[PDB]
Design a protein around this nucleic acid. Structure first.
Ligand SMILES: Nc1ncnc2c1ncn2[C@H]1C[C@H](O)[C@@H](COP(=O)(O)NP(=O)(O)OP(=O)(O)O)O1
Ligand SMILES: [Mg+2]
Ligand SMILES: [Mg+2]
Ligand SMILES: [Mg+2]
Length: 431
DNA sequence: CGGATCGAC
DNA sequence: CTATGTCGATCCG
């Protein structure tokens, strides 16, 4: 299927559903938010824009002066991870279009099935209309966890303080390693195939070794990115995916050459909404982002344009922080419609128990309890409450969540809440 | 602090 | 029949 035929079959299958109704409503809110930004832009004066331009350029020189090119950052990202695992252990599936998930939702798909536009976050029933030859295999999460542990073992040789972002992806600072490796004999860079082979002393070679070892240990491919910071490393890893790598060399000119025509969307942190908004201001590439830096310092908050300027100058993190403590724990579940109040309370109680059990594992306690409610028209509400002393037992959490749910049931009386999902989250942990 | 939104995988 | 489950950031009131 082709880029126009895809959107035709989706639109055909999605039209008139309650989900679509709610999506239209979400698109209007984004359009309005854009139109408001345009009304803001109309009433900026050339005088303000000049006083901004100076302010921004003073900061841009503060950033530029601190630019660091002396660290080598690698980002590893596995290819079609879940699907690739499922292909590995069932040969029948190879050379065929597959997705891991259910008819309600797909975690991922293999590259074969991606050619038909079936992707992560797509419901299976839509994916079947795009490609009736699609095989949908259920997830085996504990397997993926096991494979992930195999790759993290390899990664730990190259950076003991590597930063796992997910089961399938990670960041490494291979600076201390590259330095040691310059003066290494061939013995310490030699690996046998499962007839031996050696890898060179360069960064491109280190990452060829890593990828090789991953493929030998797991029978799966990864892609990778090499660059002087995390932001850039992450974008390169996507460039030659699947089963390739890319380096931006540590000199200012190569950074800027890469950035020049880079669509802002490929940056991690810029999603669909920020894309559309910035598109409306004639911003699509990272150079265009640099050009509008003054305008952006007026239309967006300090934190936002600070971020945008970092991107426009190809800057990013050059050291990896240890993974900080979690700030919240939550559980939520989608189901066939529940409208009877008594069943809704019981569901909330059950969610409160599950969450209490999960908190017990990490010995966590919190002061804020939030419930989450999605009705059959996909409209989501959250209702929270914060308490003086920390809580953690199923009873305590339910004591709070129960009242938040009562309030919502009462508010619609005599109409019943017709919900398709319910969640409970706990937050406000101690320090 | 409460509620919504964004983005990530 | 049929649109996830999570968590941190950020913005606003
Ligand atoms: N929206 C979602 N919901 C649930 N699970 C998801 C998901 N998106 C991804 N996953 C799960 C399934 C994914 O396999 C896994 C890693 O996410 P990626 O690295 O972003 N995607 P992949 O490695 O499949 O392909 P490639 O990178 O080659 O394009 O996380
Ligand atoms: Mg991947
Ligand atoms: Mg990833
Ligand atoms: Mg992005």
């Amino acid at each position: 299927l082709d880029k126009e035929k895809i959107n035709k079959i989706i639109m055909e299958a999605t039209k008139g559903s309650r989900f679509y109704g709610n999506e239209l409503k979400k698109e209007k809110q984004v359009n309005q938010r854009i139109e408001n930004m345009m009304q803001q832009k109309a009433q900026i004066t050339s005088q303000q824009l000049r006083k901004a331009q100076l302010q921004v350029d003073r900061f841009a020189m503060e950033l530029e002066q601190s630019r660091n090119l002396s660290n080598t950052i690698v980002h590893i990202d596995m290819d079609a991870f879940y699907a690739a695992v499922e292909m590995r252990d069932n040969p029948e599936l190879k050379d065929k279009p597959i997705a891991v998930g259910s008819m309600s939702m797909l975690s991922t798909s293999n590259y074969h099935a991606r050619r038909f536009g079936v992707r992560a976050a797509m419901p299976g029933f839509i994916a079947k209309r795009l490609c009736p030859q699609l095989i949908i295999v259920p997830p085996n999460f504990d397997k993926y966890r096991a494979v992930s542990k195999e790759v993290k073992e390899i990664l730990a040789d190259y950076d003991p303080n590597f930063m796992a972002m997910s089961l399938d992806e990670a960041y490494l600072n291979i600076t201390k390693h590259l330095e040691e490796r310059q003066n290494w004999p061939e013995d310490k860079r030699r690996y046998f195939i499962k007839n031996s082979v050696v890898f060179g002393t360069s960064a491109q070679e280190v990452v060829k070794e890593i990828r090789f070892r991953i493929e030998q240990k797991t029978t799966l491919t990864a892609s990778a990115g090499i660059a002087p910071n995390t932001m850039l490393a992450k974008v390169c890893s996507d460039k030659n995916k699947p089963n390739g790598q890319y380096q931006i060399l540590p000199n200012r000119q190569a950074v800027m050459d890469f950035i020049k025509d880079l669509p802002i969307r490929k940056v991690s942190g810029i999603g669909k909404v920020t894309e559309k908004m910035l598109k409306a201001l004639g911003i699509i590439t990272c150079t265009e982002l640099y050009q509008q830096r003054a305008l952006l310092s007026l239309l967006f908050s300090e934190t936002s344009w600070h971020y945008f300027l970092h991107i426009s100058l190809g800057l990013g993190s050059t050291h990896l922080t240890r993974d900080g403590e979690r700030k919240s724990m939550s559980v939520e579940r989608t189901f066939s419609e529940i409208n009877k109040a008594e069943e809704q309370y019981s569901l909330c109680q059950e969610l409160c128990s599950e969450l209490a059990q999960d908190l017990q594992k990490e010995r966590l306690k919190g002061r804020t309890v939030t419930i989450k409610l999605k009705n059959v028209n996909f409209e989501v509400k959250t209702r929270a409450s914060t308490v003086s002393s920390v809580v953690s037992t199923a009873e305590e959490i339910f004591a709070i969540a129960k009242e938040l749910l009562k309030t919502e049931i009462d508010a619609d009386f005599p109409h019943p809440l017709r919900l398709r999902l319910m969640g409970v989250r706990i937050s406000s942990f101690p320090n």
